[PDB]
């Protein structure tokens, strides 16, 4: 089974050795990144060229031979085996940019320097093979969805209208060297952007009473919108890992896990009449009935098995105790009323 | 279609219109498996849609229109097996799902297994390919 | 009743055929919006004007017929039906907004650029039906209104001492090329909102020691209290969001809403002496207070059934379960030394 | 004014100058309800002011001098009708009104649903408009 | 009891018409501030000077003559009652403002512009009298003392440490127009204040790529550790807030208030040997130790009872109530085992 | 046992009198380094050498002095006794430091102003003598370790995309006196590193509309995720804090940690046969498992002991409570079933 | 110094050396107390330094230690008192007084209440001045 | 090498192949230690890798082929040692630590705890240093 020792070392890393692999694969492909911009420098351009020259020979092919290797061992799980099942996996999009990256720089070096410089800009997406800070960053954003979407479109429409308010109360003002800052409308709303996102250049500024009282009551409140979803996302990432100390231990959810498949099961096999599950003729009929109950309760057990701990479970324990303890006391009760 | 009269009206022997828990725990009795008040307890919830704990026939209705092969659905008995696959490869050894199911959770009779065994394993050798049985399923 | 259907169309949009309806008039409102600005720069001001004219043209029309079929499908909600009531619907905001900027433009058509280019600003304010960002964003702001007002109380505290520090500490310092910068309360006034909003334009810097440390020590310590309702306001919506996965499952509050109403009515029955309920003579007095009673029960039951989960209802469940317990126990006491 | 010493008298039967559990209890089987311990449990507690488990006087004048009508109160019940209105709209109909308020919670008789459906449902159809029957209660 | 009635008005508001004297105050202080600020300006400074003149001749009247009105009223309170009781409440440092700046204003027009500007501004500290927000802010920050400082420690290291390593890398560059900008350290870091609190004011800039190096190295790691005490304190604050949804209701402490105050008289009316608490001989030793115990019982029942709802009260709930059942049960069962 | 009383007051202080002392410390070298800061200005140069001189021939004795009473002190913790002892203490890093800067600030007055001048900057690195900052912040950022590395590899990625698009569109436009702002990758990447980091000097604008709009396109976004540390560390902070109000408290502890170490040892002492512990012969084969398994469930017993409260607690208690009260209801109904 | 050693030898009647529930049980009894099980676990609690369950002699010397008039135990009475205020000005009339100290908590007996009545409010009229009164006690 | 299957089978008295509570409780009373059910509980809990409720064989071999002197093990014995030590400095009076493994826990017998403190404290002054002896074991 070397192949999937291929494939662990490849997709699935979790050793310090192949944290050096991947640590001296990053760091080379940094290194290319710096002698590209250095080639821009007008003082450093020619030697730059022949030296990126013999990187990137050697980069195209090590980056080549790594591809098929990598193809090739995807054919351990069974999600990709088969012929259909590989062409499956070259769908993800890794495979694509890794593939493009390869093709266009084989092209290059075939025959154009936006190209190289661009191509030696994408190959830093190679790093990361999981997609895993991805699969988290969207998940955190889209459990927020509306909030964001509320501040964005307050601070837009802010924006919007006290920077024509601005243009309104500045158009007729004059520079000390003597430009028209405000001239236009888009002149206007390029200052408005630059305002709200806290940056300030200093190209344009106010010159009149009026465009100053506008703008200083309108930074000291609009500022806010924009600096608001950083706050909402960094929250959300801390009580996300919050809950990570809560989990319920996953040694404890097997049984359940079984119970799930075993339900199915049966309530599958009922349809052949033949089948041994009936080994335990109308009553087939509510068979079948009390089969399909178990298996959606076996199905909302088995998700309660991976959510954290929470008071709901508490109560509903209480619940069962309760009837349970009751139940027993009250016969107790009648065999003693027995008498 | 609506022949679900017969069934509901086989649970509900007194004739009140609904079914409660002591005719389901009767009906389950009569065929021997004699359950807790507890398990009574969550199968009766696990349907009930007006909260008032008891099952009338629309709920029934509506309980016997849901139906499988969802991708909701799916997914959690894909995930089921997982817990057991040591690599995630899509592979588990015969002898290890022959012992779970028979050891674990509802502790089928081997004679279910067998059946299991022959409707899955087409491959023959070590592994069983699960991802196919569940898409049968 | 396809009255309520083209309701359901016009203000509750939910499928994703509204939703390309809802996106392709937003869409032509902001292509509306660019067409505006690029009419203000003198190159593209002649064409700008005869496209506009079209445009306008059309989608006034198309505004004007969209509001009476709004105004009329409003008369489904027995809230809006009769003349008063959808008088009423009229009263709304947003139906007054939609209104105003209907009969502008009219009037405009009619007979200006200065109206014309602020009212196809106003027209964005229309994407939004429900009100939802608004109804959101005014609850989390209204139940932290103390801090938000404690830290601009203070921020605006600090920024008038130390602007008037710093006017005292500069008001004699000459530029590089000659110009007082810091010649009057006004321009220290100014320096500073820049300053505390850390925008920092870069017009007016101090040019003496003294300012320079007095700037330096007030920086540090005021910008903060100008970021703080961001991180308020970011994490008030985390905590609310977080909420919204320990909802009480909307199917098990039914019964209670059934016995509130049952309650109250019941409640009023008392009134009319001939009335059925008293089917089930001074005992009738004592019969409304009991009924009296049941009736604020009711309505404090059927509060605790739409709040989250909480350690309250586990306390109150404990309660009731373990007198429950005592008291069968107690019997089943008595019943063993009656022998 | 102050005619709730008779009530409170008759309520207060042995006098001690309070209202206990055993009295309510007491009185509430005079009647034939039949209560358990739990819901005069929550019945006192919903009155009691000073938190001592009995009932005072002047919690009883407290009590009694609440009054309906307020805003705070009606948009409960307005709030109450919207759980089984399908689609907010303001209209319910006059067979799910009577089916919810018969087989549901308190289960009112035959007579006293039949005596609401006419103090409501003006309109005849069959739609019945809830707005202004909450507004006349 | 008028004397409560005015103290309560004039120090404690809580209705809308004393919201409207003190928002006419506030209002009226704030109309002073701003013909101040235009009193500097050349063009306005006449005529402000003889506004100012008639505005605070009459301001200064208003505030002495409520000034006397509200230290009568305080002795209402016993707090406050007899001589040093009053000269106890003028000690507070809100009366010593008001009564510096009534005294400071009437010496200033007795007989210059730089004290009267500054009591202008001193005047805005009257708006708030029970202290809330520095009472809020106070305990907020003391919660979280140690975190600050350590944040604040770390930034400072890091700005002096790479202000001095751009300092050494900059020191020999010559600007466009030609001025040694960081001639000195001072210079320095006088830039790297500006730059970790992300002001920027553009009037240095480095020169020489290892200094540009340099900053932009520093730039995205040491700029955090400046934004982070807001986060901390928006997080604080959020918190706070929260608990404020989980306050165990105000009626049901009563009793154990009751039981604190009676427990400890009773410890203390043991000292008298003839006092009537006896009325319930070396068992009053014994019976001091009870009552010792029971003082401590009570002051720890009373302090849980102003916290919030918490899961230890539900762990010692179940203690209490499961060996009760218990003893109960063992009861019974001595019951049986008795035949 | 004076060599502890001196230690606790050198390492370990929590008197103010102890406070007083590291404060004069601190203040004294503070006061040092302004000196230093006033020698590079040409005015103050001459003077400030002298008075450096004699402040550093003191300070460089106190120090020294200091540094062997501290070493000396050391040999009271039981950690550091002995010779090879005492070298593990001088094996800390501040030891190290104290070390360096002592002998290197002796070795400076043998005989170089920029490394006296380094030495008084390294010397306020003495002030925390615990290492608690680091301590603190150093876990809280490990427990957060995923998201901040997504946060920066996203936030660099986007960085370097835009500046290349931004160079693209750029390089041929000239400035206003004239020097192409844009002519190389490595200043629009120097622009891109102001932006994003919100300090925007404003030396290099954009000058083409396609700049601006795609400068205009990426500071909306791409700021937030170059603020978001901050705000996920400050809501990391808050969270911790918040747990400190829900210790268990230390007295309750006791019983386990003595249970630990006394299982610890029975277990250990089965390995010799004529131990004591076996007078409480193949019954010591099933002993010594039994041991086993009896320091393992003290040793989990301990652990739960030293974390704040939790459901899980609450769920075990009613778990053991559940059984207990069971099993005793089976033995009553076994003895009524007797008769 | 140290008599404490005799009334801890009374309470530990069976001479363990330690206290236990049973023997403070049955001083109390022996004074016609009749506490619960609970009131002696909460006393026995209060005072548990190893966290033993039992009462060692140390732990009674650390008890009887502490002494009153400290503040942060003298603000837990000022705080009670504030709770009956209705203004929070400093007076408290002398029949709620009364009333709350007779029919609520531990329930004095009106001998007790009048002693207290006279050994504070000497101020005559209708409002009590508490402050003073806790500052004597 | 799996000389366990011996102790294995001593413990699984009815042979069928699992260890119950029954079977090791049976085997504690052997001993005369009387535990509880709760003991037992906890102690089948501390082993059981499958969540079955019971013990198998494989789970035998995993919980013997643990091994003590780990890091994660020893800090736990060292912190625990902390809790008595007033001072941190590593060192504890003999007096102390006698009384405290003789009256709290398990309750060692006296001529254990003599071994015990000849086993360390080899300095014989008043302070033991307890570092050391963590090592040894």
């Given at each position: 089974?070397?192949?999937?020792?291929?494939?662990?070392?490849?997709e699935?890393?979790?050793?310090?050795?192949?944290?050096?692999?991947?640590?001296?694969?990053?760091?080379?492909?940094?290194?290319?990144?710096?002698?590209?911009?250095?080639?821009?420098?007008?003082?450093?351009?020619?030697?730059?060229?022949?030296?990126?020259?013999?990187?990137?020979?050697?980069?195209?092919?090590?980056?080549?031979?790594e591809?098929?290797?990598?193809?090739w061992?995807?054919?351990?799980?069974?999600?990709?085996?088969?012929?259909?099942?590989?062409?499956?996996?070259?769908?993800?999009?890794?495979?694509?940019?890794?593939?493009?990256?390869?093709?266009?720089?084989?092209?290059?070096?075939?025959?154009?320097?936006?190209?190289?410089?661009?191509?030696?800009?994408?190959?830093?997406?190679?790093?990361?093979?999981?997609?895993?800070?991805?699969?988290?960053?969207?998940?955190?954003?889209?459990?927020?969805?509306?909030?964001?979407?509320?501040?964005?479109?307050?601070?837009?429409?802010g924006?919007?209208?006290?920077?024509?308010?601005?243009?309104?109360?500045?158009?007729?003002?004059?520079?000390?060297?003597?430009?028209?800052?405000?001239?236009?409308?888009?002149?206007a709303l390029?200052?408005?952007?630059?305002?709200?996102?806290?940056?300030?250049?200093?190209?344009?500024?106010?010159?009149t009473?009026?465009?100053?009282?506008?703008?200083?009551?309108?930074?000291?409140?609009?500022?806010?919108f924009?600096?608001?979803?950083?706050?909402?996302?960094?929250?959300?990432?801390?009580?996300?890992?919050?809950?990570?100390?809560?989990?319920?231990?996953?040694?404890?959810?097997?049984?359940?896990?079984?119970?799930?498949?075993?339900?199915?099961?049966?309530?599958?096999?009922?349809?052949?009449?033949?089948?041994?599950?009936?080994?335990?003729?109308?009553?087939?009929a509510?068979?079948?009935?009390?089969?399909?109950?178990?298996?959606?309760?076996?199905?909302?057990?088995?998700?309660?098995?991976?959510?954290?701990?929470?008071?709901?479970?508490?109560?509903?324990?209480?619940?069962?105790?309760?009837?349970?303890?009751?139940?027993?006391?009250?016969?107790?009760?009648?065999?003693?009323?027995?008498? | 279609?609506?022949?679900?009269?017969?069934?509901?009206?086989?649970?509900?022997?007194?004739?009140?219109?609904?079914?409660?828990?002591?005719?389901?725990?009767?009906?389950?009795?009569?065929?021997?498996?004699?359950?807790?008040?507890?398990?009574?307890?969550?199968?009766?919830?696990?349907?009930?849609?007006?909260?008032?704990?008891?099952?009338?026939?629309?709920?029934?209705?509506?309980?016997?229109?849901?139906?499988?092969?969802?991708?909701?659905?799916?997914?959690?008995?894909?995930?089921?097996?997982?817990?057991?696959?040591?690599?995630?490869?899509?592979?588990?050894?015969?002898?290890?799902?022959?012992?779970?199911?028979?050891?674990?959770?509802?502790?089928?009779?081997?004679?279910?297994?067998?059946?299991?065994?022959?409707?899955?394993?087409?491959?023959?050798?070590?592994?069983?390919?699960?991802?196919?049985?569940?898409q049968?399923?």
């Open positions: 089974n070397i192949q999937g020792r291929v494939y662990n070392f490849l699935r890393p979790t050793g310090w050795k192949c944290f050096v692999y991947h640590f001296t694969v990053f760091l080379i492909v940094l290194i290319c990144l710096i002698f590209s911009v250095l080639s821009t420098i007008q003082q450093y351009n020619n030697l730059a060229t022949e030296t990126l020259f013999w990187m990137e020979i050697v980069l195209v092919v090590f980056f080549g031979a591809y098929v290797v990598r193809l061992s995807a054919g351990c799980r069974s999600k990709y085996v088969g012929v259909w099942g590989r062409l499956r996996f070259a769908r993800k999009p890794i495979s694509v940019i890794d593939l493009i990256v390869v093709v266009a720089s084989v092209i290059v070096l075939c025959v154009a320097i936006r190209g190289i410089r661009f191509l030696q800009i994408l190959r830093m997406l190679h790093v990361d093979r999981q997609g895993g800070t991805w699969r988290l960053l969207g998940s955190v954003v889209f459990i927020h969805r509306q909030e964001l979407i509320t501040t964005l479109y307050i601070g837009f429409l924006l919007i209208f006290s920077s024509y308010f601005v243009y309104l109360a500045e158009k007729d003002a004059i520079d000390s060297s003597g430009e028209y800052q405000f001239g236009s409308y888009a002149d390029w200052w408005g952007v630059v305002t709200v996102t806290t940056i300030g250049y200093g190209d344009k500024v106010p010159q009473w009026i465009g100053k009282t506008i703008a200083s009551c309108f930074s000291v409140f609009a500022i806010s924009f600096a608001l979803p950083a706050g909402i996302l960094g929250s959300g990432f801390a009580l996300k890992v919050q809950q990570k100390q809560r989990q319920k231990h996953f040694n404890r959810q097997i049984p359940a896990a079984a119970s799930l498949i075993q339900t199915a099961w049966r309530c599958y096999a009922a349809e052949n009449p033949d089948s041994a599950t009936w080994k335990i003729e109308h009553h087939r509510a068979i079948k009935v009390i089969r399909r109950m178990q298996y959606f309760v076996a199905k909302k057990k088995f998700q309660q098995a991976r959510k954290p701990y929470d008071v709901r479970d508490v109560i509903e324990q209480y619940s069962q105790g309760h009837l349970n303890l009751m139940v027993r006391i009250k016969e107790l009760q009648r065999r003693l009323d027995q008498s | 279609i609506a022949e679900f009269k017969e069934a509901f009206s086989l649970f509900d022997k007194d004739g009140d219109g609904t079914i409660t828990t002591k005719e389901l725990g009767t009906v389950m009795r009569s065929l021997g498996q004699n359950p807790t008040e507890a398990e009574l307890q969550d199968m009766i919830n696990e349907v009930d849609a007006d909260g008032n704990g008891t099952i009338d026939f629309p709920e029934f209705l509506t309980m016997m229109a849901r139906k499988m092969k969802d991708t909701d659905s799916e997914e959690e008995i894909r995930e089921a097996f997982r817990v057991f696959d040591k690599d995630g490869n899509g592979y588990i050894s015969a002898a290890e799902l022959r012992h779970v199911m028979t050891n674990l959770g509802e502790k089928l009779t081997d004679e279910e297994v067998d059946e299991m065994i022959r409707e899955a394993d087409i491959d023959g050798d070590g592994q069983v390919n699960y991802e196919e049985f569940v049968m399923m």
